[PDB]
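Hello everyone,

My group is preparing for a crystallization screen and wants a predicted model to guide construct design. The compound we'll soak is zinc ion. Before spending weeks at the bench, it would help to have a computed complex in hand. I've included the protein sequence and the ligand's SMILES below. Output in structure-token form would be ideal because that's what our pipeline reads.
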Amino acid sequence: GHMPKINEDWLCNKCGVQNFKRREKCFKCGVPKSEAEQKLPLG
Ligand SMILES: [Zn+2]
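Reply:
Good plan to model first. Here are the tokens for the complex, ready for your pipeline.
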């Protein structure tokens, strides 16, 4: 079926955490995912 693959995690640039893969911001540091690991061309 579908596969957005937005739930693909993102390693933070400050706290460096493995998050809930769907987080817009880190659970403790609160850095934006847009300011972290970029994904495949798909909004
Ligand atoms: Zn963070």
